Ligand binder design. Structure first.
Ligand SMILES: C[C@]12CCC(=O)C[C@@H]1CC[C@@H]1[C@@H]2CC[C@]2(C)[C@@H](O)CC[C@@H]12
Lengths: 12, 249
């Protein structure tokens, strides 16, 4: 993913 | 039924502070660094709000993330305009309780023209006598108003959801109106207002992109998620790969 930080927060 | 509106009112984000030190001078660096921090803080609430919207989870998870990353600017500007209207009668821009823009800050922020447009948007809530219910439904629809020209992972699910939110806006209008001609006039007005958010968001997309590229040279700080989304998704909007969905030509 190009947005690993956003994805990590979203997936939590 | 009031179910849909009950939900929208229930999930509406509360007050969010920017953490701005109002004792420091109104410099470009200080103001924009605080606006960026406010953006990160509000982004967190947009994520939680969105995930709690009726039918949102029906979208493919990658599309869920994508629409939030494309529409956050419009969503936040629209909500800020409402706060400004209700708090300071659209007199100043009420970004946060601790970050209210006056004419001086509009100038120092170097986006005076964009602030002027945002103030115009804020005033529209007053001129059109927008109700809290109309505001809530319009804001929800903004989340579904910008997509890739080539489409989402599961475009059909998105098209169905968007249609249902337009349906809900139509219902909120027909709620207190017997005459169909008046409903048509109101719907025209609201869709025109919704469309007007996009050109403003576009100017802000351009501004924040250019700012991120030269942030190191102007001492402006960008939080992690903001820098991420602005360098990955915003350029897709500026290059035309992702476009807003307008009601009118
Ligand atoms: C969305 C925010 C922050 C949340 C809000 O109330 C609206 C406001 C509109 C201007 C944005 C700002 C976030 C940070 C940005 C994107 C700056 O980099 C330039 C334009 C700013």
């Amino acid at each position: 993913s190009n947005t690993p930080r956003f994805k990590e927060y979203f997936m939590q | 039924q009031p179910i849909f509106l009950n939900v929208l009112e229930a999930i509406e984000p509360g007050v969010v502070c920017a953490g701005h030190d109002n004792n420091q001078p109104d410099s470009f660096a200080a103001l924009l660094s605080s606006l960026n921090e406010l953006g990160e803080r509000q982004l967190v609430h947009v994520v939680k709000w969105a995930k709690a919207l009726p039918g949102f989870r029906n979208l493919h998870v990658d599309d869920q993330m994508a629409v939030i990353q494309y529409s956050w600017m419009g969503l936040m500007v629209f909500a800020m305009g409402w706060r400004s209207f209700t708090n300071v009668n659209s007199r100043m821009l009420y970004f946060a309780p601790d970050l209210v823009f006056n004419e001086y800050r509009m100038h120092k922020s170097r986006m005076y023209s964009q602030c002027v447009r945002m103030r115009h948007l804020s005033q529209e809530f007053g001129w059109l006598q927008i109700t809290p219910q109309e505001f809530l439904c319009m804001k929800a629809l903004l989340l579904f108003s910008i997509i890739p020209v080539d489409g989402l992972k599961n475009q059909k699910f998105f098209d169905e959801l968007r249609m249902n939110y337009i349906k809900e806006l139509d219902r909120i209008i027909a709620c207190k109106r017997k005459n169909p001609t008046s409903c048509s006039r109101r719907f025209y007005q609201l869709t025109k207002l919704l469309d007007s958010v996009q050109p403003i968001a576009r100017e802000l997309h351009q501004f924040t992109f250019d700012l991120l590229i030269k942030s190191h040279m102007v001492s402006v700080d960008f939080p992690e998620m903001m820098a991420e989304i602005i360098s990955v998704q915003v350029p897709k909007i500026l290059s035309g790969k992702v476009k807003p969905i307008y009601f009118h030509t």
